[PDB]
Amino acid sequence: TCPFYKKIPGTGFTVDAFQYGVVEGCTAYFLTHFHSDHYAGLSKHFTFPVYCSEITGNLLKNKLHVQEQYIHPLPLDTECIVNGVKVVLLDANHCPGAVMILFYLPNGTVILHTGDFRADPSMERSLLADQKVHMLYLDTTYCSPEYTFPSQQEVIRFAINTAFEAVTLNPHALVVCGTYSIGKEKVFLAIADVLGSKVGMSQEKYKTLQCLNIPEINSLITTDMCSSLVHLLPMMQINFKGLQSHLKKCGGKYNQILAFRPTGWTHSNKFTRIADVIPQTKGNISIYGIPYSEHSSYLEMKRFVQWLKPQKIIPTVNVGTWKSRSTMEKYFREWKLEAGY
Ligand code: NI
């Protein structure tokens, strides 16, 4: 049944709650972003109103065939009224179209649901700064101090310089980037731009990217693989077998593959600087695991919460074990005591 941390008290609302059938007393279903653990359950047969960003609504219509009459896109950074309740959608710094939702309850309580987010100081100057938040439903994916990772900018620098060096040494090398969901588009787009290439991909992935309002996209992506030296493949195919096979498919146009797996975190991070990352190599194939995260590090999450000073925190991730839950609650108390709220 629908868990409590997906229900917004004092409203008829649920968030990311599409896999439970008809939720009792839900008048409006919010969707924070287009990732499968969150949208699981939506299809063309859904007939309740869905509230979401413009980008998320493009993906619902084109990829899942949800009928347009049930899709209610809202502009960001704008006060809107839904079933008599004031709401605002804020950029979540997650994947394209990902939002946080501010709810202004009729009794005066204010609730922020972060969806999935990567906290950033820029958030401290949105409409969040303008009022107090009583309850926070928090993306706690990496709520433990061992989770450090570099900025997204440093990781893109590393990838660009690595790709550019490899292809300038060998003009017959192919660069491959793994994907399984929207998000992390900067990785493959930054590499293609430095190589003066388009990014080649399957028709299904090209379709997905055409839903995202990325400026100048027709200039950066293509379904003609042959004309491209950056290819996108399913994350599952980024291993020595899958890449040896793909290399056969290019008809002797290429004699080397350099491939990137954008992982979230990997325990190489507890010991290693980004500068120090090395690939796994077999023959003429090398695979780099790079720590490109679209979730908060532990320090970024702590800073955001100590800035916000919520009266109550409700975790939405890692809530399935008592040891996880107890750990997170200990960190929330530390943060509150250190900051003085
Ligand atoms: Ni997500």
- Cβ–Cβ < 8 Å for 129, 102: no
- Output the CA torsion 291→294→296→297 (10° steps): 0
Q: Kindly give the residue spans of alpha helices, DSSP state H, lying in 222-265.
A: 240-249
- Name the residue type at position 18: F
**Distance from the alpha carbon of residue 162 to the mean position of ligand 1, in angstroms:** 27
Ligand 1 center from residue 148 Cα (angstroms): 19
> Quick check: 220 and 265 in contact, CB under 8 A?
no
The tokens describing 36, both together, are: 């499968």
Centroid of ligand 1 to alpha carbon of 268 (angstroms): 23
**Positive or negative: CA dihedral 233, 236, 238, 244:** negative
3-state secondary structure of 322: helix
Q: Directed axis angle between helix 185-195 and helix 152-169, to 10°?
A: 40
Separation of 340 CA from ligand 1 center, angstroms?
Answer: 31
What does the alpha-carbon distance between residue 81 and residue 68 come to, in Å, rounded to a whole number?
A: 20
Rounded CA gap, 97 and 51, in Å?
12
**What is the CATH code for 1-147+296-341?**
3.60.15.10
Question: 93 alpha carbon to ligand 1 midpoint, in Å?
Answer: 11
If you measure from the C-alpha of residue 116 to the centroid of ligand 1, how many angstroms do you get, rounded to a whole number?
5
CATH code 3.60.15.10 region(s) in the chain: 1-147+296-341
How many residues in total does the chain contain?
341
Fold of 148-295: Rossmann fold (3.40.50)
Inter-residue contact 259 to 238 (CB < 8 Å): yes
How many Å apart are CA 168 and CA 190, to the nearest integer?
Answer: 16
Segments of the chain assigned to CATH 3.40.50.12650: 148-295
DSSP E strand stretches across 163-283: 173-179, 199-200, 221-222, 230-234, 256-262, 280-282
- Compute how many other C-beta atoms are within 10 angstroms of the C-beta atom of residue 309: 14
CB 286, CB 257: distance < 8 Å: yes
Resolution in Å, one decimal place? 1.6
Q: Which helix (H) or strand (E) holds 39?
A: helix 36-39
For residues 107 and 105, what is the distance between their CA atoms, to the nearest angstrom? 5
Q: 110: CA distance to ligand 1 center in Å?
A: 24
CA of 3 to the centre of ligand 1 (A): 18
d(CA 322, CA 183): 31
Nearest to 94 by CA among 119, 57, 129, 124: 119
Cα–Cα nearest to 232, from 179, 181, 287: 179
Nearest to 280 by CA among 263, 264, 294: 263
Nearest alpha-carbon partner for 294 in 182, 145, 215: 182
